[PDB]
Amino acid sequence: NVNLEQLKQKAESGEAKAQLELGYRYFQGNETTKDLTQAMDWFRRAAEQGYTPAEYVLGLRYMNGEGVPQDYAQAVIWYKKAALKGLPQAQQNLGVMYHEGNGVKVDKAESVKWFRLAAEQGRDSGQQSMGDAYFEGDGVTRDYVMAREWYSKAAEQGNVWSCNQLGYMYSRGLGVERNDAISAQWYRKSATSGDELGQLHLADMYYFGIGVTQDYTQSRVLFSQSAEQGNSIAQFRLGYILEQGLAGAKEPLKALEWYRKSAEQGNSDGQYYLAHLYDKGAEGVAKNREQAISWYTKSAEQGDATAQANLGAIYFRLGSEEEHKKAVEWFRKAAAKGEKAAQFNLGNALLQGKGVKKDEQQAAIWMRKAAEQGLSAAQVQLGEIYYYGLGVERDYVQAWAWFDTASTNDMNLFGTENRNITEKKLTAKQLQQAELLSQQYIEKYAPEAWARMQKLKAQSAVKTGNK
Ligand SMILES: [Cl-]
Ligand SMILES: [Cl-]
Ligand SMILES: [Mg+2]
């Protein structure tokens, strides 16, 4: 428009708009050397005339301590001048000051008054603030319906936080009936904007086919975008996609790197998967006991029951007497959380008196818990517990039933052989009873096998009436 000298002439003539603009020339330092003293002087001259935008600007300068000592209380006074005259940005900032108790005592109801005025003028930050207020019940009574309405207005204008909130609410059924498809649409808007959490959530939805068609390639790309921004969950989820070759060839070395990124942030899942790669190895990844133990221990300490079970198992396979005791303590923690492998491992520890005093009655209890969760190895051991009467009264019918369950479950060879051996011990009626019992156990405690069997079983025909 006009240069500095021409602008100066207008400002000195008393034009408030020119005074504010001149202030900004000094503030920004583009056409003239940055000079906060001169910037403030001209900002103040414009505000002297009650020029609303300049009053708002002094609010910013006092709020931020730019060219003046930071002073929230004074910022509030300036914002209120401009807010009372309807300037949306001043209303929003004043609302924030009240919400935070910056320069004024916290007043959540008052914050909502100001957010509402800014929101009614269509500012997306105000609309978001109203959404958050109704979502939190902060200065207003909680109302997820109202929250959704305000978030929608903000999200339509590109407000990313509001997109994520809508994604969340539609996923959880807050103020609206759960709809995974609509949830995914909102998270997609977020993800396309470059948002780490929108990418994370949409990736997870493509992984499991929630609200969208299952698609590991889309999942990989979205997890990658979120992981590159540092998200520890996205990092291990991407790692798993890569290790398992779900969207490409298996890439175990690349998986390792992503698991390590996750693990180093303290993510117990990342720590688990990193440890698991060192535990089991993969193509190009050597087994490493020390690393497996170290990373399982961090994961286990964070309550990961899979890590607890696997750490104990490493110690049981190869460990000192103290390591066996530690293993039992880990199995105990994981068994308490319901991890079937830990219940099984604890059961066997108690049968042997390995790392713990031998206790066959307690062994049978843990073994049954594991067997009921479908672990065929536990079904075999529980069968032998009944066969030999270890912490239970000997019962060949129960033995046969658990062995047949294990055999049918996942073609456990020891189940099959033990069943065949036990059968000779049974009368014809005991065998009938054991077969019925195994049918019950298979349906309840090997349900995947039950379903497979039911779909394949020979069925009888029915004769239709004729003539
Ligand atoms: Cl703006
Ligand atoms: Cl695993
Ligand atoms: Mg709040």
Numbering used by the authors: 1 to 467
From the paper:
Structural domains composed of several such motifs are thought to act as interaction scaffolds to mediate protein-protein interactions. SLR-containing proteins are found in both prokaryotic (more prevalent) and eukaryotic organisms, and are thought to have been acquired by horizontal gene transfer. We have solved the structure of c5321 from uropathogenic Escherichia coli to 1.74 Å resolution. This antigen displays a super-helical Sel1-like repeat fold with eleven SLR units and a remarkably preserved consensus repeat sequence.
Here, we report the 1.74 Å-resolution crystal structure of c5321 from CFT073 E. coli determined by Se-Met SAD phasing. The crystallographic structure of the functional unit (aa 24–490) of c5321 has been solved by SAD phasing and refined to a resolution of 1.74 Å. The structure is composed of 11 SLR units, which to our knowledge represents the bacterial protein with the highest number of Sel1-like repeats solved up to date. The right-handed super-helix is approximately 115 Å in length, with a diameter of ~50 Å and a pitch (length of one complete helical turn measured parallel to the helix axes) of 60–65 Å. Electron density corresponding to a magnesium ion is identified in the c5321 structure, with the metal-ion-binding site located between repeats SLR3 and SLR4. Mg2+ coordination by residues of the intra-repeat loop, helix-1 and helix-1′ likely represents a means of stability/flexibility regulation in this region, for a currently unknown purpose. As the likely origin of the magnesium ion in the c5321 structure is MgCl2 used in the crystallization conditions, the natural metal ion for this system and its binding specificities remain to be determined. While disulfide bridges in HcpC lock the characteristic inter-repeat geometry, in c5321 a conserved tryptophan residue at repeat position 28 appears to contribute fundamentally in maintaining the same geometry by strengthening the inter-repeat hydrophobic core. Finally, the C-terminal region of the molecule contacts the C-terminal tail of the molecule in the adjacent asymmetric unit. Furthermore, crystal contacts observed between molecules belonging to neighbour asymmetric units share similarity to contacts characteristic for TPR-protein interactions with their physiological targets, suggesting a potential physiological interaction mode of c5321 with yet unidentified targets.
